[PDB]
Amino acid sequence: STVEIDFEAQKSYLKSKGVDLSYMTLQEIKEANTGSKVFLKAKIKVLDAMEDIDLSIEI
Amino acid sequence: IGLPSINISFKELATTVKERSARGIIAMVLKDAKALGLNEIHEKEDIPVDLSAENKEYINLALMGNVNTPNKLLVYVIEGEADIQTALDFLETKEFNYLCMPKAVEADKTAIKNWIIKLRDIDKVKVKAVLGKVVGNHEGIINFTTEDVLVGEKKYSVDEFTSRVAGLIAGTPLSQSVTYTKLSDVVDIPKMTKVDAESRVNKGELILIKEAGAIRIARGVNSLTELTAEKGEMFQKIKIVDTLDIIHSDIRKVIIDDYIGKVTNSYDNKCLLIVAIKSYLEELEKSALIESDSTVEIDFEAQKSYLKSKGVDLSYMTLQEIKEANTGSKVFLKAKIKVLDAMEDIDLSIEI
Amino acid sequence: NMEARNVMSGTWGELWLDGNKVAEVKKFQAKMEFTKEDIIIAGQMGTDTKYMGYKGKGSITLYHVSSRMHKLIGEKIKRGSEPRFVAISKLNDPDSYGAERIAVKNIAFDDLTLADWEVGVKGEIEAPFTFTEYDFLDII
Amino acid sequence: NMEARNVMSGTWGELWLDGNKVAEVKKFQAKMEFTKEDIIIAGQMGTDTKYMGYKGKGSITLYHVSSRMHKLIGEKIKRGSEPRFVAISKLNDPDSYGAERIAVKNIAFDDLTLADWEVGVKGEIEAPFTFTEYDFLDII
Amino acid sequence: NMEARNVMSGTWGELWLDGNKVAEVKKFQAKMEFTKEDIIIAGQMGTDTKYMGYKGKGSITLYHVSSRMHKLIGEKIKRGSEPRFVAISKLNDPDSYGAERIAVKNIAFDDLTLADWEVGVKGEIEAPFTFTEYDFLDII
Amino acid sequence: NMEARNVMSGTWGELWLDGNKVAEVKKFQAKMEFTKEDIIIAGQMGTDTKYMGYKGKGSITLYHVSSRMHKLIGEKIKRGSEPRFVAISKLNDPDSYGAERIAVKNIAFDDLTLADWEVGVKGEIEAPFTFTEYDFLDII
Amino acid sequence: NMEARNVMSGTWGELWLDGNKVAEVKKFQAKMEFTKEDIIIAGQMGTDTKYMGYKGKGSITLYHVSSRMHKLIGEKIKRGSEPRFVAISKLNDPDSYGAERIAVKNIAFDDLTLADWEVGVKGEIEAPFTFTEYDFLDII
Amino acid sequence: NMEARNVMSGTWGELWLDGNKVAEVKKFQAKMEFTKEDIIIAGQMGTDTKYMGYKGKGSITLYHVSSRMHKLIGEKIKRGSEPRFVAISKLNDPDSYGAERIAVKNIAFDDLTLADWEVGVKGEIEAPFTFTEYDFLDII
């Protein structure tokens, strides 16, 4: 499972504030200040329990 | 989503289907009024229902196969009163190994032979055709001359059984050869003598024969009969041509995918390409398809001849200078490999 | 025939690792060490040897400019899969007779440097490895 | 593309230990050493290897300003309970392409220096450790 | 917050041995070295460790002014009785945040220097030891 | 052909005992032994054999983290019943061709360890057994 | 899931012998051994077993600081009586899940050591025994 | 006259088992043992012998890369049949005089290993056997 900075959301927020995105490195966008907001994202996987069983028998 | 399902079913034992194969694509051309266009068949059960029973039996013969069933079968169907060249033009795009047409007249056979030879010699695509009665002198085409074969009380003509022959060839692993492989489904063939069969094999035909209490392929040769200084006898075997075509296809694939129009033509990139080809050959050697100690190297003589043709002053030039000289957009290479053949003749002298 | 100008200088060295050119390389080295066994033969005072094989050893040193080795091997090394690479070394001195270009194959690295820094010191990374095969291109 | 300015300098390094910034740090290092086993194969002259795992090693050096390690581990180590920590190392040189920020996890220290002083010498502390995990952030 | 003035200097160090102040002390050092055991866990590539205990090691260096160590341990060492001592170390730099005062207990020395002189050289004595316990006074 | 990467490493093993995963397993053995009878014929110099029967033997080694074996056996042996168990072993190296899963059935243990400790030594348990039949779930 | 810290260290063991704490203990063992009989059936290849009985074995090791064993035994063996003893062992690692306390009952010692010394060697005592039953007081 | 180069190295051996090449072989043994009877005569001091018969013994060792032995044996032992095998071993050192090829016939294996793994150790299989006759194909 992973946790990381949500880059697309941060870029959209910075664009909404009206700052210029041209001539800016990726690290500059990633580390840019966003007032008091924080953007994050993650990924997990959850398993399920046995509930249906199909058995085929050849006699 | 409903209630939890716990079902136990009882049923009778089912026959085990023959194992699939990783290689071998056959292209089939058929004439029927419905289900026109290209069709795909991975499993014998999946056949278009509206097709005629005779075409279905042809497809079943193709899917019979050998120790493994052929990887997949491409079926192209046309209504009728349609030129074979339209099917050929469509089939140029697709990829396949062997092609057969059960219902070819001599004109169709000539057209298919010319198409195959043009693809192999000009289009640089290595494909093969199994034809009934063609005297072509090319390693691409295989001439199967055996008439009136009985398969379960039904008579199949010489053009009709090419489907079974192509399926048998496609189902053979690369290690083995089709020499002396027996057909359990065939029950009888017309009588032939040893001398006649030997002369037919000498003329470049693949035939059926009765031997060791069964019916089996006499020999696995193609139709090439005229040998030049550089061609040689090794080119008359199906297995050798098959492995050579696989090598050609793989090398052309990697070369086109990674280097044509992709990188500048510098000496370093030539060395990188040499390394890639050598690594592929090493993998092939590990797989035991070819013998060890294969080499890949810059072709010095061809590059020197090209530079001379371009008119540059070759005098007062060191060997390294010529080796690393710019050559426009051309690359010259050469290699050396070795391939083996299977056992086919044995002499045992016994002293009593 | 032997002149001091013909001694090859290491400044004219170039390296390709996994098909990509490295520009921060500082030194490259690869060697084969033979395995020998001592054998004493009756009637002979001097001891002889029998040759068994070899082990390939080498190392790379480069300036710390980018995280090249992390992306090469880290996650796979955790997951349990060990990758193998091919390196190409070239040495072409203008005042020498010719060039020398050797390809080293089946390379397996010995470690992965995560962090190494000291205040007032520039960055450097050393990476030892082992190999099994090699090929000759452009010998002298 | 390679210029001399792009080499990262150790003076631009920072370290967080247990979530607290340490400003007296002198150098930081972290290391994974692969375990390898020789395997000889019939018919082959070159000896190959099998990858078995790794051991994580590292060290910290810092100026003697306060009692950090004492408070971190002393009483607990005496009692018989061994703590584990997380370190975060950052390397951000303005002349380089970007930053590097790696987190090292499951750190267990190797010793505890109680006192070390000599007349006419400034105080320093070296602390080795072991670790088993890490994560990549801000990889160049 | 971190200034070069705050680094503690060893000239401001004092030592008490067996309740008496030593004035010729040159350097004092005491450390605890942990004992670890490697443990391999199925399914994990990184090797972990188990903490089992520690050993206390240290040493004292002082100018040769008086026969302090002879009177401390000689006759008892012959007779078969090994004495144990308590040492107090203090470090108070005027430009530091505070002082550091540790007591080392259950000290057993490693040897007793009878004579060591060379013409044209001043006298010095080094005395390694081992300990088991310690206590914290005036931490920073 | 054989690659050095294809040799299975034992770190990638797993064990289920009576349906519960055993995370502290160290090694697992299981082997079938065949009994032979010598055949000697008067007038013939050679000697031949015929198979008589077979038997199964093996053992388990664990790290000592809990009282698993005492709970598993409990009072069953004391009261006089005949407890039998089923074990499942898996070996799945990512670099090998595939997995290998075997079920070992009808297991009877040889003894039970109550206490086995020493100062300065980490604890382990060894448990031999015998069995009668086996099944192959995953083959390679 | 298993951690390296959960392995019990033997330095945390304790022993009570006849109600008196033994501070000089070095190691303790106690094991129950089961006896088996092979079952062979004509016409079947496989061989099976059934349990027959059990027996208890163990031993103790002590540092030699006093004559504890002689006072414990006394003249009871010489006078022809049959003395028996009770032992309680505890293992309580702070980093583990819990404690494990077992009572071993009906102990008969195997021998008595009167003197075993050598110049330059520190003394130890070894005492094997047999027992018949046991009780569990704390389960981990 | 003998040279050190003429001693055969075991890296150049090859094995065929039931017509299939075994690329993971590690070592191969095959030996014929003769049985003797002592002859003693009254009135004479010396003791003489006569031959009685012979027997064959050997073993194989493999790297664990697949389940070759289980597929080779299968259920043949369990079903009560008596399986036998043929092995061919070749030794062809380039520096020796020639090759040596032997066929070992009527092989009966002694046991079957189902699982034998340990954390941090690479896997191997050992398979002893007995045989009755042999043929020589290439003599050096």
Numbering used by the authors:
A (entry chain 1): 296 to 354
B (entry chain D): 3 to 354
C (entry chain a), D (entry chain 7), E (entry chain 9), F (entry chain I), G (entry chain 5), H (entry chain P): 3 to 142
Reproduce the article's own wording on this structure.
Here, we report the atomic structures of an engineered diffocin, a contractile syringe-like molecular machine that kills the Gram-positive bacterium Clostridioides difficile. Captured in one pre-contraction and two post-contraction states, each structure fashions six proteins in the bacteria-targeting baseplate, two proteins in the energy-storing trunk, and a collar linking the sheath with the membrane-penetrating tube. Since the sheath and the tube are anchored together at the opposite end by the collar, collapsing the sheath pushes the tube through the baseplate, driving it to puncture the cell wall and underlying cytoplasmic membrane.
The diffocin baseplate has an inner section that connects to the tube and an outer section that connects to the sheath. Two conformers of CD1371, Tri2A and Tri2B, and one of CD1372, Tri1, form the triplex, and six copies of the triplex form the baseplate wedge, surrounding the inner baseplate. Within each triplex, the N-terminal regions of the three subunits form a core bundle and a trifurcation unit, from which the C-terminal dimerization domains of Tri2A and Tri2B extend in opposite directions to interact with neighboring triplexes. The C-terminal region of Tri1, along with the tail fiber linked to it, was not resolved in the cryoEM maps. Notably, both Tri2A and Tri2B include a wing domain inserted between the core bundle and the trifurcation unit, reminiscent of gp6 in phage T412. These wing domains contribute to the interface with the hydrolase domain of the hub-hydrolase. The N-terminal domain (residues 49–105) of the sheath initiator binds to the core bundle of the triplex, while the C-terminal β-hairpin (residues 106–135) interacts with two sheath proteins on the first sheath layer by forming a conserved handshake interface.
